[PDB]
Amino acid sequence: GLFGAIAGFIEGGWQGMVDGWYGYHHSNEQGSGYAADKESTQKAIDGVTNKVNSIIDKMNTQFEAVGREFNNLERRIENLNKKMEDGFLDVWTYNAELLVLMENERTLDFHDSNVKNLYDKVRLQLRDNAKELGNGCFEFYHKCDNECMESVRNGTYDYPQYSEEARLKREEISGVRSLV
Amino acid sequence: PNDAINFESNGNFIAPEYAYKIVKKGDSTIMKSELEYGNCNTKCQTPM
Numbered sequence: 001g002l003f004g005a006i007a008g009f010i011e012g013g014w015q016g017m018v019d020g021w022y023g024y025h026h027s028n029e030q031g032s033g034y035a036a037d038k039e040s041t042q043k044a045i046d047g048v049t050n051k052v053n054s055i056i057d058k059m060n061t062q063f064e065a066v067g068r069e070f071n072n073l074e075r076r077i078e079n080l081n082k083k084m085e086d087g088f089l090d091v092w093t094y095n096a097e098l099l100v101l102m103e104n105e106r107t108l109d110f111h112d113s114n115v116k117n118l119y120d121k122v123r124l125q126l127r128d129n130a131k132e133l134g135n136g137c138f139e140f141y142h143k144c145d146n147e148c149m150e151s152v153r154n155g156t157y158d159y160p161q162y163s164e165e166a167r168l169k170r171e172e173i174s175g176v177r178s179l180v
Numbered sequence: 181p182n183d184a185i186n187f188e189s190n191g192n193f194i195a196p197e198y199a200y201k202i203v204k205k206g207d208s209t210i211m212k213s214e215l216e217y218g219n220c221n222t223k224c225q226t227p228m
């Protein structure tokens with residue numbers, strides 16, 4: 001969409017992810033499998049929920065309605081009465097229809113950042129310890145087990161810890177060693 | 181209240197026996213449906 005994640009570089013959603021709206025899949029010597037980022041799926045829901053509750057709270061002071069009755073020779077003030085209600089119900093319909101259509105467009109392009117910005121957090125933590133592969137996905141220079149995945153997932157990876165593991169690899173897939 | 185109302189006529193006069201005390205005053209409408217009662221209870225009513 002706007003932010004270019006959903007229906008963007010991350011081509012299509014995973015059906016295998018059921019626990020939540022956004023998450024990580026991994027692969028390593030032991031593991032392989034999905035795991036939703038509940039804490040930020042959770043933050044997203046707090047939003048979309050507030051949004052519904054905001055609209056209900058705007059629609060209790062609409063234009064109200066109770067009834068009135070007219071003589072046969074007052075026909076044209078009957079009309080005026082009718083143009084009125086039918087003016088006001090033309091106007092709250094538009095406001096409803098348009099509010100939904102707009103807040104729908106924003107809600108969809110909200111999810112499209114939720115996902116971009118999740119991708120950017122993983123990125124900023126892992127720097128040149130991992131190779132950004134470009135289809136939504138990173139592969140590591142240092143091997144990184146299930147206990148290290150959580151650390152990425154819960155956002156407390158530790159760059160300096162795997163630095164020389166990683167840069168031994170970078171150093172050699174640069175074939176700079178190939179000179180001896 | 182405390183107002184008198186004095187009639188006087190020498191013909192063609194249909195007089196009251198009964199009048200009507202406004203006891204409870206509030207909210208309602210003269211709703212214009214053709215359905216008869218269905219023994220339910222709501223908080224929202226519409227002619228359909």
Ligand SMILES: *[C@@H]1O[C@H](CO)[C@@H](O[C@@H]2O[C@H](CO)[C@@H](O[C@@H]3O[C@H](CO)[C@@H](O)[C@H](O)[C@@H]3O)[C@H](O)[C@H]2NC(C)=O)[C@H](O)[C@H]1NC(C)=O
Nearest residue numbers: 181182183184185186187188189196197198199200201202
């Ligand atoms: C229908 O009946 C009512 C109730 O009895 C009558 O109202 C009362 O009329 C008397 C006088 O006849 C009022 O007294 C007046 O009080 C003022 C000020 O306190 C005083 O200066 C006057 O000299 C006089 O006596 C009394 O207040 C009034 N009752 C109330 C509470 O409204 C009434 O006369 C009858 N309806 C009519 C006027 O056609």
